[PDB]
Amino acid sequence: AIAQLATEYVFSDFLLKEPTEPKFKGLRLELAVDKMVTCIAVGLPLLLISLAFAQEISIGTQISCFSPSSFSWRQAAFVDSYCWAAVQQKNSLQSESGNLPLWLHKFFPYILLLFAILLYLPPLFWRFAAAPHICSDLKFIMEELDKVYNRAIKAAKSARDPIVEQYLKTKKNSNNLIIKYISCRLLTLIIILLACIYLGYYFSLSSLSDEFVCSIKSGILRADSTVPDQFQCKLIAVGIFQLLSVINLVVYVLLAPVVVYTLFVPFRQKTDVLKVYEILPTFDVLHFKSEGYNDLSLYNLFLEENISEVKSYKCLKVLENIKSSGQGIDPMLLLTNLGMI
Amino acid sequence: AIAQLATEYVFSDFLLKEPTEPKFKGLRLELAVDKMVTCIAVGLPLLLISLAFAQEISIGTQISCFSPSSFSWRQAAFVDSYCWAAVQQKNSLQSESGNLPLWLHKFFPYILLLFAILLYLPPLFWRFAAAPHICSDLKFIMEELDKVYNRAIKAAKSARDPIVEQYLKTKKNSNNLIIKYISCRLLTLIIILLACIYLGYYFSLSSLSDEFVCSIKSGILRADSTVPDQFQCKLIAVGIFQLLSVINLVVYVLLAPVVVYTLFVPFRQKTDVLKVYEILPTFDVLHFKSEGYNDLSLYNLFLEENISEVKSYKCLKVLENIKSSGQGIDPMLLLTNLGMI
Amino acid sequence: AIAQLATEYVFSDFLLKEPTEPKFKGLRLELAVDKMVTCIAVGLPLLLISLAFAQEISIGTQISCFSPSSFSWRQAAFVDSYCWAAVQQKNSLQSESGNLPLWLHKFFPYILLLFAILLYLPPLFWRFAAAPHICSDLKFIMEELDKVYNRAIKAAKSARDPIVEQYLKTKKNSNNLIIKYISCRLLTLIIILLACIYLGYYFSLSSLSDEFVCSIKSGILRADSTVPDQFQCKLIAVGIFQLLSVINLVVYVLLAPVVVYTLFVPFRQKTDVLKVYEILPTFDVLHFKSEGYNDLSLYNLFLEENISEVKSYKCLKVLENIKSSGQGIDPMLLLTNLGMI
Amino acid sequence: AIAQLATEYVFSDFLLKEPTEPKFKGLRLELAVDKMVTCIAVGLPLLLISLAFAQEISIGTQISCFSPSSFSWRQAAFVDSYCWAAVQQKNSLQSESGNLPLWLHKFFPYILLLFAILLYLPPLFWRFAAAPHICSDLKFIMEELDKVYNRAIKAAKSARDPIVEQYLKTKKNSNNLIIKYISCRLLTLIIILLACIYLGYYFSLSSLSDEFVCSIKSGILRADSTVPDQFQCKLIAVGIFQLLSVINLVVYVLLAPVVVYTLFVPFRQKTDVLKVYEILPTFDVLHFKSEGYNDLSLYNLFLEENISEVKSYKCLKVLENIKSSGQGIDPMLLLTNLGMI
């Protein structure tokens, strides 16, 4: 049923399943925008494949050939199957548009599936090539940051009663993780553009290319006289193919700008999470994280993503908000917070 | 079976599944009215799609064409499939109402599915764009509020034997979360109005537009003489489509007032949860939360929603009720409550 | 449906299931490259088998024979089944290409399944022959290494306030595990090359070998006169077979270089994990692990794989990174880390 | 689908399910070679049964009889069913090869299933007759051995700062468990040889025995004149049967050497696990476990299997390896290990 496909591919957490493993529990490792881009670009062609052959649209066979009335039931079935298999043998069939349109009409689901798999590949490469590195690294970074906050709080309390910095500093120099990331991003963009090109071509077919003339006159039937010289076959479910093709095209051409936007990692580094902790006196009072096509920018983005997980950041951020309001004091309100654990 | 669809889409918690994650356990993040509006507006077209093709209403094919008696079984099947695919090719078929009614009759399930997906989109954008922010924020707010209550109770006990305020204060100024919310609300309203327009048009079709004249005379069949000039086809299951369309129309036009009501967030801020804690002496004796198209109003609504979760509010609220009755005393009954944990 | 096969064989963790047992929890025992090579080489022919007979491509029967019109329905069915079973009996059928092409056309799915099983065998032999040995050994090695790190940290702290080496040393001499590994690697390579050869041959068939002349004239039918001398049969779904064959061929010929690369275990030993711990003063300041076709190289690779699991390595590695930056000091920053447990 | 059968019977842990019970958690009770032999010998005929009737090979019915054209559809169906049921009644049908080939062709799946069950029986008898005894016994043995190791370690530590032997000794005399084991081994061998004999006979059939002449002339039809004297039936799916039969034959004749090898339990007792603990001074310095067709040999094999489970053995074995290298000292390195628990 259509509604089951709808649930499975839109309303269920399809490709939204968190890593079912104790290694990555609560950590993102994939920016939400990239995750939704991948989910769309992959699940949409699958959904359209499943829709093109839903029992509510498909009338039956994918082809019909209109054998003469003198033919039996089984001779008609033979003609149908023969021409279905003969869309490939270019010697027999003769269509106005050519053999390539028929090739495409027969294998449209396979092509959409190929595009889905190709679009799924770069995210898989990212999840299995650069995900564990950044996972471990930002895990250590959050641990060290929370520890720095606890140290600042203990120092302020004692007054009342920087290795992670060097790590981010050295990360600013290497650029392995960022070229991997922009490589996957560029790969997805290229595959999406090729898919839009193919879909725009396919949707642009003569809309009568699904009608082709087929002839069962190979082998011993060539001398047979009771068979007509040619049969008028028609590839059913081609209009549905072109419609879903134009839909996929319109969606992918809307998606491509999002991808080419995600391509610019330095421009996206905004709402500096480093400033909140910079308000604290103990840690270095410096953002020290911006303006560079290097892994530092990538870690900035992933920190801005996974930063709500540490309570230390939540308290420091609400305190920063009140500082923008300017009501109380930093160490007094920090001691009043009492959120070490 | 119909009853299985009934269970799945009405009696099961379809789209009522709580977030299966330790991050959001017991927190709402979606007002109950918005949740039910989304569940209705999305699951209803899905349910009607599943009903239109239930095995108990559908007689069989979606089309039948009444080929002459001299035709074989397979020639008749070919005519049926050809005309089914030829509802799109406007050159062949000639109907009184036009080709657009037939287009709509064939793709009615796809259109209902498109409307379901479009109506599901804004809630998804809300759940993935503004949900974590408000989640963390109101979580911190409830923690600070419960802590304020424990502090007031300890102070009253010692007599016997305000950062969250500034947070709500600064929230009153920014308006990001409220424009996001009213944007999703307005989006759902626009999509619902477009759906009602389309359904009112579709249901208003001539009810004979499902009968169209089709002609298999393209290709080599144009010279064929044993074929009749045209066939009388009829799109079965169109009356069912129009009936379910009028049902969906009547439901969506009842739903739209609820949406346009939810559009007014300040008017909905009622039964001030802040007053209960204002009865307490320690916390600021002021509502300080009303009368503004800002995130403060949004947080008021979400607090009024998720406020039954904190026991501190339950005790203070029953105490406020007794105060409205006027029997005992506030600190004495608070010490007699003994509900710190 | 095609999309279900897609999910099951690409998007689900097919052959990516971790060992569901408390013996191996978090340990790899299979290099990621070998794991993906096996998953591809095995699941791809299965996916193509499932695709070749998807309800969206398959028109129906796998064969049709075009009996004369005077034949009944059941006589036609008999002719079809007879010729289907008679692709093997070489005395009856006479095809231009020969009987071997028809043999292959009938049993193509069985051959692809055989190749899948054969490619799955060497990984199974590795997982059940050499996996527990290396599991226990590298488990002990990581335990001893973490213990060495804790000892160095305690020594540095006391200043403030080598059996695993011999094990790796003796492992450098034996070469059982490495010949097992390169034997499985060479086995997979040979099977892949044979599969590419067979697929290149099959895809290179005349594309009309699916049409063969069959004759039901054995037994009592030899004297029957109302039967024609021969029937023109055609093996449907052969073009699909050749297409998926060319796809599998193109994928396997891309895979073979990866395998022959994995064949060189010493060349792959890079990014020495031993150097990080060599920076520590307590443990032996020497890599002592390289340049040899022996089990030592294999353990180096498996350590480089499973080394992110021990936190001790994470701390020492970030410290080594800062040392490459050159900001602080080793024992002071180690005491400041405080990551013993 | 074929790929589902592939997953279920090869890639899933079919007959590899560990005992889902707290009594046997982590204990083997079945040597890995015997386990794989049983899994192959049982699951292979099941897999071939499931393959012989996969929807991708089976054309339809298992028989077709070619009734005359004057027959109706239902008369033809009657002829088919009659001859299918009449392969047993030897009075009616007359085939060149005889009635036994047809008997075999009809009941080939049942025979393969019978062989699968018969091969599964001896492992079941072992698992339910001698498994608990050896389970409890080797459990106690490992407990006593680990305890002996802890005692030796405590003695060495005190210097720094034998009932299990008698049990194995008395086990050397009784021979119940070993005759049970070799009885199951011999049973599996005999069943495998009988299966190879039957399969070699079946595959050696004339390949035209699937064509037989059937006659519906019993009862009132004997006087009927409009029925022909005999019908030419053909058992479809017999070539597939013979092919899968030759496959099963080739696999079983490869398996039989493995079984007859497993028959020699004393020869298999190698890589003495007793020597590792013999290196320890406390326990008896003697293997005292070899050279006898008695339960002692069986316990040696099961200990060599389940010996990696005790950490005590792992430490003593790595220490023995270093002793073969000759670097340090036994008690000092044992105290440095610190692996009592």
Ligand SMILES: CC(C)CCC[C@@H](C)[C@H]1CC[C@H]2[C@@H]3CC=C4C[C@@H](O)CC[C@]4(C)[C@H]3CC[C@]12C
């Ligand atoms: C990503 C954006 C640019 C996609 C837009 C759709 C593009 C790729 C489509 C739309 C119309 C298409 C064209 C329509 C018709 C023809 C004529 C034919 O003889 C060659 C291909 C050609 C020239 C097509 C090329 C691809 C095309 C230009």
Ligand SMILES: CC(C)CCC[C@@H](C)[C@H]1CC[C@H]2[C@@H]3CC=C4C[C@@H](O)CC[C@]4(C)[C@H]3CC[C@]12C
């Ligand atoms: C949300 C509320 C307002 C929905 C009410 C249903 C509306 C949208 C429906 C009900 C009747 C419909 C009309 C019925 C008939 C026609 C004539 C046709 O030639 C053009 C469309 C037009 C003019 C329709 C437009 C849409 C319509 C006005």
Ligand SMILES: CC(C)CCC[C@@H](C)[C@H]1CC[C@H]2[C@@H]3CC=C4C[C@@H](O)CC[C@]4(C)[C@H]3CC[C@]12C
């Ligand atoms: C791994 C790489 C090398 C695989 C490349 C495909 C190879 C194996 C394929 C491609 C074309 C094939 C050839 C095509 C045609 C013929 C003629 C025939 O009478 C004998 C086999 C022979 C000679 C084939 C042998 C195998 C072949 C050479």
Ligand SMILES: CC(C)CCC[C@@H](C)[C@H]1CC[C@H]2[C@@H]3CC=C4C[C@@H](O)CC[C@]4(C)[C@H]3CC[C@]12C
């Ligand atoms: C385990 C090994 C030995 C199995 C080898 C296959 C054996 C059992 C097969 C292969 C060929 C077979 C023979 C083929 C033909 C005949 C002639 C027939 O009138 C009696 C049975 C007899 C004599 C068969 C007996 C079984 C047989 C010898």
